[PDB]
From Swiss-Prot:
Zn(2+) 1 binds at residues 50, 52, 110, 112. The chain holds residues 869 to 1008 of 2193 of the full protein. The active site is at 15 (for protease 2a activity), 33 (for protease 2a activity), 104 (for protease 2a activity). It catalyses: Selective cleavage of Tyr-|-Gly bond in the picornavirus polyprotein. Homodimer. It comes from Coxsackievirus A16 (strain G-10). Cysteine protease that cleaves viral polyprotein and specific host proteins. It is responsible for the autocatalytic cleavage between the P1 and P2 regions, which is the first cleavage occurring in the polyprotein. Also cleaves the host translation initiation factor EIF4G1, in order to shut down the capped cellular mRNA translation. Inhibits the host nucleus-cytoplasm protein and RNA trafficking by cleaving host members of the nuclear pores. Counteracts stress granule formation probably by antagonizing its assembly or promoting its dissassembly. This is Protease 2A.
């Protein structure tokens, strides 16, 4: 589990969104596994606006933050899970790292801020849903 709290937005994995998230919806995209809802309190996370390919992510199944090298956001094939059939997921970045289903939502960050959140995994790989292109998270 986990979310990004930026301004009056809460960014979560679409497959982990709650009823309150759907009842306060700002934007969602199944192809990216992302959903954004509105918040009453202001958040403290800042979004990175960069093309970094190195950073650090949080892994809840190890209680550890790991430094990783990750691919550029792309259209990647992801195997069937409890939440989606086997399909192409867009704006996804891959790295070598430990992940389990419940690790979704962990933040990936670089020197500029939050890059994205854990969205996929298995077999020593971890995939992150990028958020750096969502410029509207910084305003309104
Ligand atoms: C942390 O990711 C791991 C790790 C190990 C095994 C499996 C997974 C994830 C949770 C499987 N998936 C892919 C997700 C998606 N974004 O399509 C939806 C889903 O259930
Ligand atoms: Zn960066």
């Amino acid at each position: 589990s986990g979310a990004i709290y930026v301004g009056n937005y809460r960014v979560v994995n679409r497959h982990l969104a709650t009823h309150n998230d759907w009842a306060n919806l700002v934007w969602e995209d199944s192809s990216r596994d992302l959903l954004v809802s509105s918040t009453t309190a202001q958040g403290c996370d800042t979004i990175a606006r960069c093309d970094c390919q190195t950073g650090v992510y949080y892994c809840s199944s190890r209680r550890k933050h790991y430094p990783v090298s990750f691919s550029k956001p792309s259209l990647i094939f992801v195997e069937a899970s409890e939440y989606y059939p086997a399909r192409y997921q867009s704006h996804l970045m891959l790295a070598v790292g430990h992940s389990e289903p419940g690790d979704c939502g962990g933040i990936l960050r670089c020197q500029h801020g939050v890059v994205g959140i854990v969205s996929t995994g298995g077999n020593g790989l971890v995939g992150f849903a990028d958020v750096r292109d969502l410029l509207w998270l910084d305003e309104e």
